[PDB]
Amino acid sequence: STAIFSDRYKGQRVLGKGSFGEVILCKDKITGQECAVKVISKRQVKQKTDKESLLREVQLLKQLDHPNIMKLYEFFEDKGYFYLVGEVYTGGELFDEIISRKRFSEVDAARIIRQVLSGITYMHKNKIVHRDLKPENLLLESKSKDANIRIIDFGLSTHFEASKKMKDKIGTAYYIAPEVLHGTYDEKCDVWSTGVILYILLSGCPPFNGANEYDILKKVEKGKYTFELPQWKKVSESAKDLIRKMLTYVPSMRISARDALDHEWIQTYTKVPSLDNAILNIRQFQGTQKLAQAALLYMGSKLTSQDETKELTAIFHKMDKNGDGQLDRAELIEGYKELMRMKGQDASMLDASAVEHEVDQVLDAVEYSEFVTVAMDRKTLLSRERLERAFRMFDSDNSGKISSTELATIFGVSDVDSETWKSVLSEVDKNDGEVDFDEFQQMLLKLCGN
Ligand SMILES: [Ca+2]
């Protein structure tokens, strides 16, 4: 409120797009301490509670400390944004580390879940519920195999409204507790979500699955699942018993996070065959989720580029006094600053110094029409290379193609209607039942107006 964020911190690099907003690697201008700042835009996110309830939870969260909980250092608020400043972790997402290794057993799964439960138990004792616990929120403290897990976004859910855009809801339906869907829930919803993560660690397949978001939510609401897949034969009976207690439908009957640590499976496997079939399915699952996410962000970046391309052309056309199509470097900065003044402050461009530098980078490469193409191509370049990398990673056999069955699974996770993508495919392809990267990219372009 009183203190300004930009006067203390400077943006160094974009870490990624998390829940509620963009995540930026920032650095203190005095001490040089690196920090990860989640920037939540007030227009794209609505406040569920009042301002005084939010400040009270922020104050509590700043005093909490646990080795498996991400530390919240500071909190800032300006006219249109909320900035949540915390510690940086470079180890990446838990599931990205599991797909790289060749050996994964119940001892590794028990060591993972013991950490997740230690953090949850500690936060539940302080009356803080996560509500949106999922593998994406489990980060590794360092780039190593024996590194600590840190749970992020612990306590946001209660004060910020969930996004309705599929690019942000991707992969959430698998882990949500049934009682969260019907409205009456408490801290037991985090035990269910951890139970779902444990089920995926030991088999590589979600317990509640479907061809789309709604079919998954129907399975979660019914609450029925089975240990009827071949890979569950090589898993112990105590692991299955803990999952049964964690995935109990009635929350009052469901085990607590505290009692889940004292369970025989945690006590025996933290104080042993390799689950090879489970690794292959986590690889397939992670690749499928990441390609679906990359496809949705690619379409979103193409629509954002079209909006900003025309908006920046209109700003520069009005600034062109004589009408030769040219402008000075100082004029282009005024017009680029006007784009952020009209279409909101950018996550990468925190202050005027970052805008002046962003223009100098485009001016070094590059008529304002040519400059418009470069500045917009730089924003699309960050999204097109992620799509190709995700397509290449999904294509594990390096065939260069993805089958029609794989497209149905991808578009199913992305929530693109079955009849809509099949029609778009016939317009570009026109019939081997498989598409290459360019054809896949052409389908996404046609699925967002281009
Ligand atoms: Ca292939």
d(CA 207, CA 233): 16
User: Which 3 state secondary structure label does DSSP give 21?
Assistant: strand
Q: Provide Rg for the chain, Cα atoms.
A: 24
Give the helix ranges, DSSP H, for 204-351. Answer: 213-222, 237-246, 257-261, 264-270, 276-319, 329-343
Catalytic entry in 132, 168, 190, 346: 132
Buried b (16+ CB within 10 A) or exposed e, 390-422: bbeebbeeeeebbeeebbebbbbbbbbeeeebe
Contacts for 261-268 with beta carbons within 8 Å, 24 or more apart? 261/114, 261/117, 261/118, 261/121, 263/238, 264/238, 265/106, 265/110, 265/236, 265/238, 265/239, 265/241, 266/110, 266/113, 266/114, 266/117, 266/242, 268/110, 268/238
Distance 128 CA to ligand 1 centre (A): 44
Resolution of the entry in angstroms: 2.2
Instruction: Check if 132 is active-site.
Output: yes
The alpha carbon of 316 and the centre of ligand 1 are apart by a number of angstroms equal to 45
What's 383-429 look like in SS3? Answer: HHHHHHHHHHHHCCCCCCEEEHHHHHHHHHHHCCCHHHHHHHHHHHC
Give the up-direction half-sphere exposure of residue 236: CA atoms within 13 A in the CB hemisphere: 18
- How many angstroms from the chain centroid is the CA of residue 388? 18
Can you tell me which residue has the tokens 């281009």?
450
How much distance in Å is there from the Cα of 434 to the middle of ligand 1? 9
Question: d(Cα 446, Cα 139) in Å, to the nearest integer?
Answer: 35
- C-alpha of residue 318 to centroid of ligand 1, in Å: 49
DSSP output for 169-205: HTT-TTT--HHHHHS---TTHHHHHHHHHHHHHHHSS
CA 54/CA 57 separation, integer angstroms:
5
DSSP H stretches of helix in 204-275: 213-222, 237-246, 257-261, 264-270
CB 192 within 8 A of CB 180: no
Kindly give the distance from the C-alpha atom of residue 395 to the centroid of ligand 1, in angstroms, as a whole number. 4
| CB distance 407 to 421 below 8 Å | yes
* 367 belongs to an annotated ligand binding site: yes
Cα of 18 to ligand 1 centre, how many Å?
Answer: 29
Is residue 429 annotated as involved in ligand binding? yes
Q: Is 406 annotated to bind ligand? A: yes
Residue 299 CA: distances (Å) to CA of 22, 376, 402, 415? 17, 14, 19, 13
Q: Residue 293 and residue 206: Cα distance in Å, rounded?
A: 17
**How many C-beta atoms surround the C-beta of residue 9 within 10 A?**
22
DSSP state of 162: P
Distance CA 94, CA 70 (A): 14
Q: Which two tokens stand for residue 445?
A: 């372009």
Which residue is it, tokens 């005093």? Answer: 63
Q: Is 326 annotated as a binding residue?
A: yes
State in Å: Cα 173 to ligand 1 middle. 27
The total of other beta-carbon atoms located within 10 Å of residue 186's CB is: 13
Strand 34-41 versus strand 81-86 pairing type: antiparallel
CA triple 187-250-178, angle to 5 deg: 70
Contact criterion met (CB below 8 Å) for 376 and 305: yes
> Looking at the DSSP assignment, which residues form a beta bridge with residue 26?
11, 35
Q: Is 153 annotated as a binding residue?
A: no
Q: Is 401 annotated as a binding residue?
A: yes
Buried b (16+ CB within 10 A) or exposed e, 59-69: eebeebebebb
Is residue 35 within a helix (H) or strand (E), and if so which, with residue range?
strand 34-41
Look-up of token digits 């400059």: 371
7 annotated binding-site participant? no
Technique used: X-ray
Rounded-to-integer distance, Cα 263 and Cα 440, Å? 47
What's the rounded Cα separation, in Å, for the pair 419 and 411? 11
**Distance from the alpha carbon of residue 347 to the mean position of ligand 1, in angstroms:** 35
Residue ranges of domains in the chain, CATH in brackets: 1-90+154-161 (3.30.200.20), 91-153+162-284 (1.10.510.10), 285-450 (no CATH)
SS3 22: strand
41 is in an annotated binding site: no
User: Which tokens in the block code for residue 10?
Assistant: 């400077």
State the distance from the centre of ligand 1 to the C-alpha of 420, rounded, in angstroms. 23
| Rounded distance from Cα 392 to ligand 1 centre (Å) | 8
φ, ψ dihedrals at 321, nearest 5°? -70, -55
Measuring CA to CA, how many Å separate 150 from each of 115, 117, 138, 341?
8, 11, 6, 36
Distance 401 CA to ligand 1 centre (A): 5
Per the DSSP assignment, residues forming a β-bridge with 140 are 149
Q: Is 434 annotated as a binding residue?
A: yes
Short-list 130, 132, 139, CA closest to 68: 139
At 316, the amino acid letter reads: F
Q: Is 397 part of any known ligand binding site? A: yes
Amino acid sitting at position 72: L
Q: Does 322 appear as a known binding residue? A: yes
Residue identified by tokens 């209607």 is 417
